[PDB]
Structure 1
Amino acid sequence: GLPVMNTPGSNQFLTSDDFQSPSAMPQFDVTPELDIPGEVKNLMEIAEVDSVVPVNNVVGKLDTMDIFRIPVQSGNHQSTQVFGFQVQPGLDSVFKHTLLGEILNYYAHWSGSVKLTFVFCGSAMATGKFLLAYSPPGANAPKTRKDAMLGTHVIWDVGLQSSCVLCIPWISQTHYRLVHQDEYTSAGNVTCWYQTGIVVPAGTPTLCSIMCFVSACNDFSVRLLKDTPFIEQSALLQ
């Protein structure tokens, strides 16, 4: 009988612990391993993949494919903003259900840059330039293109390359932000403006669409596993 003393935490079931147990099936011969394509070793490999952002999440469109298309058109419309949202990649109804947003809502802390790729889906004959502007927090969202072009912007010229990348860099006061973001860990906003119109010939549709893809850059990371606020049930057998 070796002398021994039990410490607090004995006979508790911590759901996160990591101890050896006895096998209920001793010497069980496990099936051989099969080289299946597409093995995941980190959820960040998943969140690094684009997913169509629902930027047009306005009423009457939440159940349609029109929720994905940002409408652009020809004419003098520079006085109007194409779109704008908050960079809350796990709280904003524009991002919470994207691949990145879903992976985010399993954690409490996120860090790193986020790519927004924009894709033009008009005719090959339609041409246009856009200003895509990410503004860090501390001021209101810009109301004019003159204000938006003071933040981090890209002037996207539409051509044979149909997509532009606006990388939102990590400009934070803290190493991590909260996925459930409040005013302390705010991250800014993204807006779009017509830089130089949309010019189209005759016999061509004058109103086209833009698509938004969100993904996480290679410096992105998460912290503090938690449960999603998304899936819920009232009873078992479900």
Structure 2
Amino acid sequence: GLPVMTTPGSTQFLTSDDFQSPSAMPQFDVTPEMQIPGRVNNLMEIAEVDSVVPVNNTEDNVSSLKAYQIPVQSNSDNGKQVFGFPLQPGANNVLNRTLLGEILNYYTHWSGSIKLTFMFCGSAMATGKFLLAYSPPGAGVPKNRKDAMLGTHVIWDVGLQSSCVLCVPWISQTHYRYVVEDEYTAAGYVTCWYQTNIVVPADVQSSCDILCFVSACNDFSVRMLKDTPFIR
């Protein structure tokens, strides 16, 4: 008949191929499609919605709803830190189990931006001010309010606005420096500082709380899928 010649790699099962296949049940007339709402075309639509970050882990609030709330009070010390978390990826940071950090653990190299919305869940009469300072990679954690002011900062007025947005980058790879070693200095920090105290009227409670959300600002760029480490 016709002359053919079988090349090497012929009777093999490569588990990542794309060949045709004989259908085990023809003549079936399957049920046609129906307009079901909310169709996912891409996994970068699960990422763009925003979820709440458990900033307040603290070893016994993790089995509670107290892990999500940042405590804020009115103390007698002029200038102090409210919270602060690094941005070193993978190593047990707070953005790991969120709705963004569960997608990006299915990949190995990713690079993009982050929105970080805050929200003051206190009374409608309480007034104050907050510093939202971002330390770029290479610069250390700020220790006073003054040198935290000199970096990148957005000063947040509570009484005028109940929600502040701080957009930072986040990269899978951290460029170390050869001589100076610390667990996370070339990652970043999103620490926050008491600018003024919280001044409140009579018959209003002073101890308020803050929620903190995270999202993806622009589109990411993921590559080389793998399997997640959140399994036995």
Structure 1 residues 122 and 31, CA gap change in structure 2 (3 angstroms): same
Does 2:26 correspond to 1:26?
A: yes
What is aligned with 1:11? 12
Q: Alignment partner of 2:4: what SS?
A: coil
1:56 partnered with 2:32: no
Alpha-carbon offset, residue 2 of structure 1:
3.4
How far residue 89 of structure 1 moved from its aligned partner, in angstroms, is 5.3
Q: Which has the larger radius of gyration?
A: 2
Q: What is the CA–CA distance in structure 2 between the aligned matches of 1:22 and 1:124, rounded to whole Å?
A: 67
**What is the aligned partner in structure 2 of residue 236 from structure 1?**
none
Is 1:177–2:161 an aligned residue pair? no
Q: Residue type matched to 1:56 in 2?
A: N
**The 10-residue stretch of structure 1 (208-217 or 137-146) with the greater mean CA deviation from structure 2:** 137-146
Deviations 1:51-81 (A, max 9, x none): 1100001111110111111111113444321
Is the Cα–Cα contact under 8 Å of residues 74 and 200 in structure 1 kept in the other structure? no
After TM superposition, give the deviation of residue 3 of structure 1 in Å. 2.8
Segments of structure 1 that go 5 or more residues without pairing to the other structure are 171-175, 233-238
Query: Which residue is equivalent to 1:97?
Result: 97
Percent identity, aligned pairs only? Answer: 68
Q: CA deviation at 1:148?
A: 2.2
Q: What is the CA deviation profile of residues 153-210 of structure 1, one whole-angstrom value per residue up to 9, with x for unaligned ones?
A: 211111364211110036xxxxx524xx685895311100012221111111111100
> Alpha carbons of 1:9 and 1:199: their partners in 2 closer, same or farther (altered >3 Å)?
farther
**Structure 1 CA distance for aligned equivalents of residues 78 and 112 of structure 2:** 32
Aligned: 1:65 with 2:60: no
Please report the RMSD computed on the Cα atoms of aligned residues, expressed in angstroms.
2.4
Q: Structure 1 residues 130 and 17, CA, compared in 2 at 3 Å: closer, same or farther? A: farther
**Structure-1 residue corresponding to 2:206:** 206
Match of 2:180 in 1: none
Local SS of the residue matching 1:210: strand
Structure 1, 111-120 or 146-155: larger mean CA deviation: 146-155
Tell me which residue corresponds to 1:84: 84
Q: TM-score of the superposition, structure 1-length normalised?
A: 0.84
Runs of 4+ in 1 over 6 A off after TM superposition: none
Partner of 1:147, secondary structure, is helix
CA contact (8 A) 1:78 1:193 kept: no
The answer on whether the counterparts of 2:86 and 2:93 sit within 8 Å (CA) in structure 1 is no
Distance 1:226 1:21 in 2: 27
Query: In proportion to residue count, which structure has more strand?
Result: 1
> Is this contact kept in 1: 2:88–2:187, CA < 8 A?
yes
Unaligned runs of 5+ residues in structure 2 are 178-183
Change (3 A) 1:24 1:140: same
1:28 and 1:56, CA in 2 relative to 1: closer, same or farther beyond 3 A? same
Secondary structure at the aligned position of 2:24 is classed as coil
Larger helix share, 1 or 2? 1
1:68-217 to structure 2, matched below 5 A, reads: 68-88=68-88, 90-159=90-159, 161-169=161-169, 177-178=172-173, 183=176, 186-217=186-217
- Contact 2:138 / 2:187 at 8 angstroms: preserved in 1? no
Distance across 2 between alignment mates of 1:199 and 1:125: 9
Distance 1:9 1:122 in 2: 69
TM-score (norm 2): 0.86
Is contact 1:77-1:194 (8 Å) kept?
no
- Aligned-residue offset at 1:98: 0.2
In the TM superposition, residue 134 of structure 1 has moved relative to its aligned partner by 1.4
